[PDB]
């Protein structure tokens, strides 16, 4: 053949501003956590990645909020969404229900979702835990996944790199498995 890679997968990352969408993408693609400048949106990025028996062409689309009441081009052609909220922001968790799930039901009804809790390094910090009465536990994260019908739930930290690869590996596997 003239093409050893025959599957393209468009993976769009969405969720509230400042939860860590862009850093996840920089972490996954570069194996580095940015310490100075972080762009609003990661460059549109595409690369071959090996998942199981396969090499696929992964296209990563980053997003940023807009005040737009027209009722997004970036969603067109999406095979899977990574829907991020921060493990230390209740508002971002509640916005998955109030903002993001409504948006995705309207604009991308049949597209699966990988639900991602970010900033695991903060949520799991014992100092943080000791001072907060009502923490977003893995249990609450799994309850959200269930409520929204997401394919998987993953907790990660771009800062320590924990489970970042798992996010996009799982996104790919959801698309490739039945
Ligand atoms: N502690 C910690 N901070 C993070 C992590 N990911 C992102 N951040 C910080 O969270 C803020 C927002 O990150 P960014 O990726 O720009 O979020 P985005 O608006 O969703 O794209 C920045 O100051 C990042 O340094 C993480 O895993 N752990
Ligand atoms: Mg960003």
Curated annotation (Swiss-Prot):
List residues binding GTP: 15-22, 62-66, 118-121
What GO terms fall under cellular component here? plasma membrane
- Name the InterPro entries for this protein: P-loop_NTPase, Small_GTP-bd, Small_GTPase, Small_GTPase_Rho
The entry lists its GO molecular-function terms as: GTP binding; GTPase activity
Q: What is the topology of this protein in the membrane according to its UniProt annotation?
A: Lipid-anchor
Where is the signal peptide, in residue numbers?
A: none
Keywords linked to the UniProt accession: Abscisic acid signaling pathway, GTP-binding, Lipoprotein, Membrane, Nucleotide-binding, Palmitate
Annotated GO biological process: abscisic acid-activated signaling pathway; small GTPase-mediated signal transduction
Q: Where in the cell is it found?
A: Membrane
State the span of motif (Effector region). Answer: 37-45
- SMART domains attached here? RAB (SM00175), RAS (SM00173), RHO (SM00174)
Query: Which PROSITE patterns did the record assign?
Result: RHO
Report the principal subcellular site.
membrane
Q: Which family does it belong to?
A: Belongs to the small GTPase superfamily. Rho family.
Q: What does this protein do?
A: Acts as a negative regulator of abscisic acid (ABA) responses.
What PANTHER family does its record include?
Answer: RHO FAMILY GTPASE (PTHR24072)
Protein known as: Rac-like GTP-binding protein ARAC7
What is the protein's species of origin? Answer: Arabidopsis thaliana (Mouse-ear cress)
